[PDB]
Paper text:
Signal transduction by these ligands requires type I and type II transmembrane receptor serine/threonine kinases which form heterotetrameric complexes for ligand interaction. Type I receptors phosphorylate SMAD family transcription factors, whereas type II receptors are required to activate the type I receptors by phosphorylation of their juxtamembrane GS (glycine-serine rich) domain.
The structure of the ALK2 kinase domain in complex with LDN-212854 was observed to adopt an inactive conformation similar to the more complete structure of the ALK2 GS and kinase domains bound to FKBP12. However, at the solvent-exposed entrance of the active site the binding of ATP and substrate would be sterically occluded by the inward folding of the activation segment. Here, a single hydrogen bond is observed between the N-1 nitrogen of the pyrazolo[1,5-a]pyrimidine moiety and the backbone nitrogen of His286. In the inactive ALK2 conformation the catalytically important salt bridge between Lys235 (β3 strand) and Glu248 (αC) is broken and these side chains are free for interaction with inhibitors. The nitrogen of the 5-quinoline of LDN-212854 appears optimally positioned to form a water-mediated hydrogen bond that bifurcates to contact both Lys235 and Glu248. Thus, the 5-quinoline of LDN-212854 appears particularly favourable for establishing a larger network of water-mediated hydrogen bonding in ALK2.
Residue numbers in the entry: 203 to 272, 276 to 498
Amino acid sequence: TVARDITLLECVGKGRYGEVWRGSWQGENVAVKIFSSRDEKSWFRETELYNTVMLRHENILGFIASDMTSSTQLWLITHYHEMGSLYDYLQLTTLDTVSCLRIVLSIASGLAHLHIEIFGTQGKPAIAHRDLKSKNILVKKNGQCCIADLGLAVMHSQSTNQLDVGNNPRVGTKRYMAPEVLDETIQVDCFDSYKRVDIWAFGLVLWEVARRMVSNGIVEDYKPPFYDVVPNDPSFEDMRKVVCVDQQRPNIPNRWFSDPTLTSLAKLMKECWYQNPSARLTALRIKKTLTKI
Ligand SMILES: c1cc(-c2cnn3cc(-c4ccc(N5CCNCC5)cc4)cnc23)c2cccnc2c1
Ligand SMILES: [Ca+2]
Ligand SMILES: [Ca+2]
């Protein structure tokens, strides 16, 4: 087994999900996500996406191995990214135009890759993520990002027209839940519903990043979305009130409109945040717009 030969060196993330460790394997750093037995279905779902669908892309976290024994240990072993999550990186780092755009374009490219079905023996189904957020995005050494955590992924194939929703009781992070998830109007049997939930979350991530880009000597501090109106670890109900009832969206600072880049990002965000899921931009459209700037 790969698991047998790994030396675990330091814990770099703790939580309800489990833990993530920097470890060593054959003289190289690797990341080991150790799942609680409560989250066994997420482990299996990631394992199938990586090891059966062969999901691989420069902006998706690189799989190395999966191991389980049983009383029960469930390991997912991936490339290790020493800069940490986008959430970690944004707390200490400010950005310029080049590094801001490199970040958001890479996330869009990863998300477009998930969303688009590819045909052939080397292909893949269309995939929606369902827990996109800044903690589930890693910053790589080259300044681009990659998307992690496919435990809630749902798939669709045009040939069968089958929605593969899997069987996981876990639900998305509440802070990033789209209006239609919070008011339970989401059309659960339509694959496109899940893509539009990702786009909502992507919009929130764009906001998080854009705040940290310096323009005209000004930058905002890191805040999570809805920091001003819900507590830490907000409830389903806290979010429903803010997003559905009050129809609140994250505030766009007026200073952004005097910078061309932040002006473009502000326009994209707003078109990720429509209450009508159908009106939201596609991942491909976001990628194309970010490529044009
Ligand atoms: C497997 C592996 C990871 C994963 C891959 N690399 N990595 C680095 C970290 C990580 C997080 C934080 C830090 N540091 C924090 C303090 N300041 C310096 C950086 C350093 C590394 C966390 N998780 C991962 C992962 C990340 C999110 C979700 N699922 C995952 C599943
Ligand atoms: Ca084993
Ligand atoms: Ca922020």
